[PDB]
Amino acid sequence: TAISVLLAQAVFLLL
């Protein structure tokens, strides 16, 4: 993972 998704979330916003 539920923490792995975060990296993908902050990745999209960046992007």
Cα(first)–Cα(last) distance of the chain, in Å?
Answer: 21
Question: What is d(CA 15, CA 7) in angstroms, rounded to the nearest whole number?
Answer: 12
Method: NMR
Neighbours of 14 (CB within 10 A): 5
Query: Which residue type sits at 7?
Result: L
CB atoms within 10 A of CB 8: 8
